Symmetry: C3
């Protein structure tokens, strides 16, 4: 099994979140994705405090696919500099991890 | 002992609620956050599956992850539920002391 | 300049927003995602408590993690709120550059 990782991404709306997930999944760049709607994202954009609706995405993939996934998400995200972060999975259920890998 | 965060996906509220009370009673986790209204997407049989799920986030220590995962797995209705462990590289000393003292 | 995500549990939305808007102004965090509609279960004095909470996910770097936690802790209504730091082992170059450039 290749090492697993968790990818965090935020979409500006549910339609966008929906087809960003469908895409990376179709192209086998992620094993599965969880969408958490009704969130808010605060940050400074050009010296101004912005506050916008976001769908928090959580995608499961492996370290060998993370970059491909990242670029695909970036390529289809409507924003120029979308949130794309990778967190390491230091431990997980063997059967689930095997399934994660099999999916890719 | 170092802390970790555990991600687990539950089919519904009752299940998420059952797994949490369970692992907390067993003292295999210090706390658990539940976030309903989530959507999990994945391919099965070659088609795109979309299900409503409850995202779980459990806090524990490295020495418990094995036990916690086994507990969550056996009590979980699904066959091979999502069970991932993320490392905590740093945290508030007082909150970490509480986490450890609670297990 | 390693990046990290910080998890913080806020009791309500107004509090989560004030904490976010504060750490962002102080430039201790580059972005804060607030996820309402959650609950937290834990034992307190032997009793099982379950409370509504807002899950916060803040983005910063290792250099600022300590100061970010100190600031959050101070303005957090709780005595010892959940403050956990998770490592970001990789991310999109443009996002990371933007994140880093947003910090103090």
């Amino acid at each position: 099994n290749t090492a697993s990782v968790v990818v965090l991404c935020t979409a500006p709306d549910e339609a966008t979140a929906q087809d960003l997930a469908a895409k990376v999944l179709a192209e086998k760049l992620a094993a599965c994705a969880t969408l958490i709607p009704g969130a808010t994202s605060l940050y400074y954009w050009e010296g101004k405090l912005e506050q916008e609706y976001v769908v928090q995405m959580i995608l499961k993939t492996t370290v060998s696919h993370q970059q491909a996934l990242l670029e695909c998400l970036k390529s289809h995200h409507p924003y120029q500099t979308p949130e794309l972060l990778v967190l390491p999975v230091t431990h997980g259920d063997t059967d689930y991890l095997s399934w994660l890998n099999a999916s890719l």
